[PDB]
Amino acid sequence: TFQPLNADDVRSYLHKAVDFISDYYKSVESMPVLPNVKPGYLQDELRASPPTYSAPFDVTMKELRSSVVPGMTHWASPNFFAFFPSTNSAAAIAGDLIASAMNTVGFTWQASPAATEMEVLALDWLAQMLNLPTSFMNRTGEGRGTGGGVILGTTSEAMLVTLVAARDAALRRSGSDGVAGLHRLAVYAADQTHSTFFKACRLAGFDPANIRSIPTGAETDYGLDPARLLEAMQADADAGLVPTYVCATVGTTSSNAVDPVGAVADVAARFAAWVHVDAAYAGSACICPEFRHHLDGVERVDSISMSPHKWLMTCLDCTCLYVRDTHRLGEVTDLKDMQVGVGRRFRGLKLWMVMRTYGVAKLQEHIRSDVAMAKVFEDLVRGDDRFEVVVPRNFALVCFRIRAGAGAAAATEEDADEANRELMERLNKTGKAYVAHTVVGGRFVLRFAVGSSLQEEHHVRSAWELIKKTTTEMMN
Amino acid sequence: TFQPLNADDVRSYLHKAVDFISDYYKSVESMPVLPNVKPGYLQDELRASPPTYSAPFDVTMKELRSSVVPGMTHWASPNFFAFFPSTNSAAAIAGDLIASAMNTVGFTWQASPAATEMEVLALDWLAQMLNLPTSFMNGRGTGGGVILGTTSEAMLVTLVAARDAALRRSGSDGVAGLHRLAVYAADQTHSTFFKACRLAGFDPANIRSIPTGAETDYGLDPARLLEAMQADADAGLVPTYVCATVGTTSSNAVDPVGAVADVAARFAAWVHVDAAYAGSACICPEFRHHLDGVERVDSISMSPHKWLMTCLDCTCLYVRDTHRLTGSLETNPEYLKNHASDSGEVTDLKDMQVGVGRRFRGLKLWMVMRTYGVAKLQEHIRSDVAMAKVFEDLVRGDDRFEVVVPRNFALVCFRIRAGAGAAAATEEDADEANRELMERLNKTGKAYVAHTVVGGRFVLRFAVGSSLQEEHHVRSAWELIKKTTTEMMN
Amino acid sequence: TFQPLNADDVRSYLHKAVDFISDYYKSVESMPVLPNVKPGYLQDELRASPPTYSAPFDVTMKELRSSVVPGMTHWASPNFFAFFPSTNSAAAIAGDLIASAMNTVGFTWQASPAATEMEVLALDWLAQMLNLPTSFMNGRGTGGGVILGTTSEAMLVTLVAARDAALRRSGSDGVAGLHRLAVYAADQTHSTFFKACRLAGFDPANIRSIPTGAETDYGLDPARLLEAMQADADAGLVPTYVCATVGTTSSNAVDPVGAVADVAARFAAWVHVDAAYAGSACICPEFRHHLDGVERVDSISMSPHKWLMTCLDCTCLYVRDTHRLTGSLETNPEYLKNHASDSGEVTDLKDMQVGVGRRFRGLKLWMVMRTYGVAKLQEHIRSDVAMAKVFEDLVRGDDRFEVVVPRNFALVCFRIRAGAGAAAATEEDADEANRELMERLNKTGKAYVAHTVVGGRFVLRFAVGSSLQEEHHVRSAWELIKKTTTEMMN
Amino acid sequence: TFQPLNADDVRSYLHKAVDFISDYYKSVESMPVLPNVKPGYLQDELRASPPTYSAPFDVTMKELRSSVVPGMTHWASPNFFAFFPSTNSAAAIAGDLIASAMNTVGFTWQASPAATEMEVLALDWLAQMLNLPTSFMNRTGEGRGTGGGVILGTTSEAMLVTLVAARDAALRRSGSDGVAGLHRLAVYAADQTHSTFFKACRLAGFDPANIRSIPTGAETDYGLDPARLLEAMQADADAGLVPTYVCATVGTTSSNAVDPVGAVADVAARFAAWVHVDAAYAGSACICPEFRHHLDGVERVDSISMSPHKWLMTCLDCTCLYVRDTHRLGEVTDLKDMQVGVGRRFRGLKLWMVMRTYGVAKLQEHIRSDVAMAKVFEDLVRGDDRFEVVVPRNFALVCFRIRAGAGAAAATEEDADEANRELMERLNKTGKAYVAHTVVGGRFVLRFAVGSSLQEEHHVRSAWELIKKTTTEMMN
Ligand SMILES: *Cc1c(COP(=O)(O)O)cnc(C)c1O
Ligand SMILES: *Cc1c(COP(=O)(O)O)cnc(C)c1O
Ligand SMILES: *Cc1c(COP(=O)(O)O)cnc(C)c1O
Ligand SMILES: *Cc1c(COP(=O)(O)O)cnc(C)c1O
Ligand SMILES: *NCCc1c[nH]c2ccccc12
Ligand SMILES: *NCCc1c[nH]c2ccccc12
Ligand SMILES: [Ca+2]
Ligand SMILES: [Ca+2]
Ligand SMILES: [Ca+2]
Ligand SMILES: [Ca+2]
Ligand SMILES: [Ca+2]
């Protein structure tokens, strides 16, 4: 007699969830962004064992309010300035709600034709927004493309599955008996490429000795030097190793550096190496013509990924992987085999709803207005001699720091490192900001990632006032 | 001025979504479980290109109802009988909705303390329901767990940990020795295990698919496993990892976990238990014996998004030594550093998975257990098992049919017997008669049945438990099987 | 390589269209006659821009069913009771389909001889059914006819011919004298007549709307017309054209054609008879008296696309002297010259209309008469009249209501009487009660009723004859009126 | 008991009509394009009076086959080369079939919301295809335009209603008491503008003395000289007359001349005169970028019309009128009042179906392939010294003639006039062509209008062979 999807519970539980969400967005700014809890706090609030009997959903919701919410970091806060914002939208939430309720598993087209076709559709649509070549598209206006896509959970998963494909292709090219020649394969990326990529390399079975982190410096604004790449790949080829894969990043995590995609593709072409472009964050901006040059040369690379669940208003998970000329690996299917596990939820519905409800023009103005707020902040930092913008701002992330010589409490560059750490910690104690750091050229640097979905320009200006106020109180 | 999370839209879009969900559940039984669409229909109806301008959300919902829903296979239908049902609940849907709205990314504990602490709590609660040994929970314990999206990822990361330890202790020169490692699973083990082996760099020649047969009800014969492992060792290979399945995908065979563990311990091989579907049953004491010996394995996974009313994605992995996983999976990039991670007192769950980011998946799982309670979760397992028993006994009382293997949970494997009619004299005729019966059942729209092969024989699976499905749906499906069969014989 | 008329597409698109039409007629009664859509819904659903690429016609038909049909007011519904019904037939639809496919443009006889000769034949056949004087047909006759799209165009071209003759004979200096010309119609004459006067350059101060009242059942009083014309003449104006209506749009009043003609003949004014709706009834001998005196008028029009089962557009204009029309309307451009036109033996129908091109509209009208015959067309008029009489007598037997004027054809004008209940004590209350009754009836979706004003009183029209409508639809609509009324009183 | 729309008749009558149409298109080429009937033939075939009783539809269809079809001029023939082709499509026919069956009258939005909204939609869509300014559009992507459109029956109706609006506006500007000053208003067009325009002028009440036909000559390829226009409009203004309206034609009927729209608009702006652009035939080509310059300046004119029922595959009737800044004359309505009679059929459904089924790209290639066939013919004529192409070909119409001096039977220019007339008559007697003529610069000229929907390139080449054969047999 127990019906977990009975009509009354479904409507009343979801209505209570929706009420919570409405209130949460209306009040999240009034909360401290970073919570004031210590590890282990939750087990001192909630019972240690699952309850034997059922409770009213109201009891569950009040434990969510009393014990969960106060322990969260509010990514949705307009004063969240860390990492990259997980931008979101009413359409994306509604689409994921509907996918959760239908709860289909699309491991084949037959297991749900609409789910597979919508994932292909959403991928082909976004490929058009990015102005990708037809070689990355499944369906075309009248016919078929020569490429394909799949909606994965993470950029790391995108890296792994393209690493595996490149691995097996190089093993065949080099006459390996199975994996016996795996120790001859080498892989390459700039040292600013995310550390999860080198981890993916190790997961795929590449030898630690042949995984190359190419040093970058400020003379290229920490983008990969194609000459240093060629030098490293040639030396490996000369020594009997097989250059197998290069990851180029458009918009690195630490400082939003940009690797030159076309130059990297040409250098890798000397060795028939696979080239993957990681544009997890900044890829979203490339739907705008004034950012699309960052992907020039993508037509010569083998794969590209970007994550709408960062900067395209689509809640997690949504990472889009595109692969060129898929025939080296009618029926309308995504590349379900370039996926850690086939057998996961209908991720495509929310991405389609985002594009269909808002349209390309609003998606582009969402990018442009975030960039404009980032420029407002960058220009405020540049107007205060106590600070410096440590690298050029390419998108909506600004890297800045208190200079050495700003005050007597920042006399040496070691002093400045400590002052910037103290500033970041003071900002986070106010509850009116969440700032985290990185290291650029040996220096402790504050990141300022503009774009939390609820955040408006006055929030950024107010954050800057707070940075000025806090610095001033520190320096005397 | 464009505000994607403005209060008006958030409320009305979600209310329109809830109205759709309400209607959908009320009307899904009356739709055909399988659609009647051709490949490529969707881009025909929606367009080839995204719109330049915006549209009211009512339009999006209209295209959902008009173009998406008619192309769906309705997993939620009470007449969906294939694969394993994706059981679901109002609480799980509500939890995932709230997690989607808060949309926190919990790669570290600091990135959102409650997201990681609730996941740990939820895993611990499920471990208690499962009566897992305390060595899988977390004093001095090394045990621990992670929610992942899939069994495949759970297989992948334990394969990688086993691989790295084998290469290290066997003196591999980097990965030059990877071609020496060997892995084992019964031939009834899900195909994604063999795929995860290939992902991790294991050599295809060294991935052992151990034959099984009716002698063990297609469970893994431990003597045959010992034979295969010893032979590899004698040949200079390194036996590295064994996968045991409790509740196989095809016929719900159960591998003897304890004896597999004892055999593999002669080689210090990693033992993982895949209980993706049947693990949820083990919250019931009459099924917990299928996990006896888990106290001697290295890892076990099961998916609440199959049989524990928690919408996809939700797969729970438990390990006896988290340090063996984080050794292979951890990173320490500068931009993620924080005092809590430095202190060693928290586990950053990015170090238990492939990726960095992750959703707040603990919320839905906790909401399911917190709202419904153990007793209701147990009765949910039991009532599905009883419905499947009803169907099993119906099949048994009709001499044209046979139950192909013993029924351990809520999947019945059955077949039109050989010699049941003039259109099934041979076994080759029965093979074709069962395929005809399956295609006919699906064509009515009042069933979705898919097949498997059990010992060379074409077999129909009847997987009970779709959340909206009641006993009368199962009885009516049997009547539909009988009547379709009778019409096929003459 | 793109072939818009390839055989495969022509056949399958049209078969899909016929299937839609079949379904539409079978299901239209079950839709609400009036839609429930907001202004602007369509571009929301279809997009703001045309697609770059092609789509299967099945997609076009799907958007027809999903987005167009739900926004329609269903003229074809048996419960459509407003305006005048657009009566239709399988033969007329088939005729227009074939004309659309052959898609000839018949500006001259040579441009397609059969298109013009069948139009002449069809007009002649209808003139016979109407028992028009032979002076309207074509020996030595000057009479003749043209099929036009609208009564408005028929009004326009006869206004222009009358205008040009008045200016010529009254000694206008070019069009300097146009402000001296005057035109007359009863105030019950359709608003498009006064619009056509303005199009032709008549002065708004000189366009006479003669008052009518209950004394003549709102027909034009010829003494009041003579008064208005004589007064204008005495003042130096030139009475130029009079329009008489047989079957007015509001209440189906009938102007006395003979006496209007005799009054206008004292001034040599052009007399046109507008019988757009009721002219089709005059194929029945018991209605032909409404046209007595047509033998003395200059022109008469009526629209088979109202009450003669010929889908829009189809309006027939007859004149006693085609030369008075072609004098104003003809052109002789060089590229259209041909021997048949030069010979004077054919009438190029571009010289009887505003435009150059024209469809083969004679085909549908001829197919209707040829397939069904006069007797069936007569019985079609009579059965509609009898259904309207049924409704009229129902209204009469209920003391809360009144029939407002005598019923001449198949339109009943009725009203909630003053003093019928406590919510209709005054006439101002009855005016509001009838508007409430009308809005309620339409809200049910089982009726579409619209109103008119008869002698300062808010009145409901009940226009019988929608082609799918049977007597039980009329009886059920009366029951719906009674029950809606009763619920309104308390 | 007689149901004219009973289900059996509807299906069987329409199926017989569809069978007829299928056969007709398959066999129309085998018929003589021009029929061999004399005036009055039909009344000698069919009964003189309507039948008293009903007959089976088969009887009706067989009279269509026996007596109607043999008397038709087959506009649908691939060998129809006259006037302008009435191009057509399966989608347009299906849409008009469906409109005929629904049979709604859309004189208000409420009388059928979908019909009005679809007419506005189809107009706004085609305006985008023509790249008309927003000032001619009803709805915009996110908001509203400042203009509007209406789907009329004819170009003449478009002329009349814009003439009326311009007339009443000039009467108010000039202080006229009603129509008392109508004799002061003057109107203008080149002498190549269709004669139905000067007729429309007379219908609207303009004085014959003030209706101006501006002479054109070969020095402008018979396009209107803007200087001659200004000279005529200035002289009228100087004399006390009120210049009220100018019609500019893009693609004249006789020779497809093109009036300079922008220059004409600027000249008319001196006098505040209304400017209408008639592009009945050639307007359809302006959905292609390489023809769109012909409409340069449309942004400064008051109205523009073109007819999809000529060159955009939409069966009659379909003439689209657009009016700029409609506020000088929410709710979504066409300009139903700029229409001779409000109260006509749902013309919009077939135009939408054409655009939705085939898409912009196929509509453009339909224009380009007709033009290409026209160029093939033009180049064949130019390769034979006995002929001349008398004006430049702008679209898919070619004007050509046998020269004087071609043979001894074409020695004087009067002889050539008679030889071209004899050629045209011989071509039409074969039944394998329908050619009609015009006069250009005092000379008898053959028109050759490419584009009948069934016509392919071999049909045009074969017509040229026939012209060569026939000329040769004439000249000896
Ligand atoms: C369903 C099932 C799986 C599915 O694995 P995923 O990676 O989650 O797609 C694996 N193993 C078993 C036994 C199953 O029943
Ligand atoms: C966010 C980020 C990642 C992390 O990706 P996951 O989805 O967590 O695997 C990788 N690369 C870049 C450039 C990133 O910004
Ligand atoms: C319906 C009707 C009209 C309609 O005129 P149109 O120009 O065809 O729209 C005119 N007069 C009368 C009496 C009518 O009943
Ligand atoms: C076809 C044509 C016309 C004739 O228009 P109608 O629709 O018959 O009134 C007018 N002008 C031009 C340029 C034409 O080609
Ligand atoms: N260092 C990674 C930051 C990150 C990882 N996954 C993510 C998803 C969404 C926003 C940010 C993010
Ligand atoms: N001289 C006019 C030719 C013409 C007039 N109306 C038409 C419609 C369709 C094609 C040609 C045409
Ligand atoms: Ca923003
Ligand atoms: Ca809108
Ligand atoms: Ca650590
Ligand atoms: Ca159940
Ligand atoms: Ca297609």
Ligand SMILES: [Ca+2]
């Ligand atoms: Ca003549």
Ligand SMILES: [Ca+2]
């Ligand atoms: Ca009737």
Ligand SMILES: [Ca+2]
């Ligand atoms: Ca063509």
